[PDB]
Structure 1
Amino acid sequence: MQIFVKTLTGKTITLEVEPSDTIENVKAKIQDKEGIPPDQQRLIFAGKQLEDGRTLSDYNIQKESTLHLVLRLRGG
């Protein structure tokens, strides 16, 4: 399925995922695609910060959903 991840620069990352993907795997995909270390990523769906060890399906994230990506810089 596709999901859309809006970033703070105003760019949207289109990802191909499965509901069975952990949030940690989603952050690995963003590291692929945008070069951002997972440690810096905070993913938000429906106002909730997503937990690395949970899956997209735990959050009821369906095809064509929108997430937000906030970056936390180390030492910030």
Structure 2
Amino acid sequence: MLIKVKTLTGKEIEIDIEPTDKVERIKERVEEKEGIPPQQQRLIYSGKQMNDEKTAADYKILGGSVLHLVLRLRGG
């Protein structure tokens, strides 16, 4: 599959993924491409915030689908 994932800066990057790959690995792809530690990565697919132990199938991710690296801040 060829999926997309907009980073925190709007930059969208593609990935090599088979419906079998865990969320965990999807994150592993982004890092390899961008440098964003999977550790500080929070991916979200259609309101669902993907758990990195489940598979890309568990969320109905179909090729052309788009993921979203999001975040939440402590200050204010």
Assess if the C-alpha contact under 8 Å between 1:42 and 1:71 holds in 2: yes
Which amino acid is 2:36 matched to?
Answer: I
Overall identity of the aligned pairs, in %:
57
Which amino acid is 1:60 matched to?
Answer: K
Counterparts of 1:32 and 1:14 in 2: how far apart (Å)?
Answer: 11
- Paired residues in the alignment total 75
TM-score norm. by structure 2 comes to 0.89
Deviation at 1:55?
A: 0.3
Flag the structure with higher strand content.
Answer: 1
* Aligned counterpart, 1:41: 41
Unaligned runs of 5+ residues in structure 2 are none
Counterparts of 2:15 and 2:71 in 1: how far apart (Å)?
Answer: 18
* Aligned counterpart, 2:30: 30
Partner SS, residue 19 of structure 1:
coil
* Aligned counterpart, 2:63: 63
Deviation at 1:72?
A: 6.1
After superposition, the C-alpha distances for 1:5-60 in whole angstroms (9 at most, x for unaligned) are 01121110111111000000011111100011111000000111000000010111
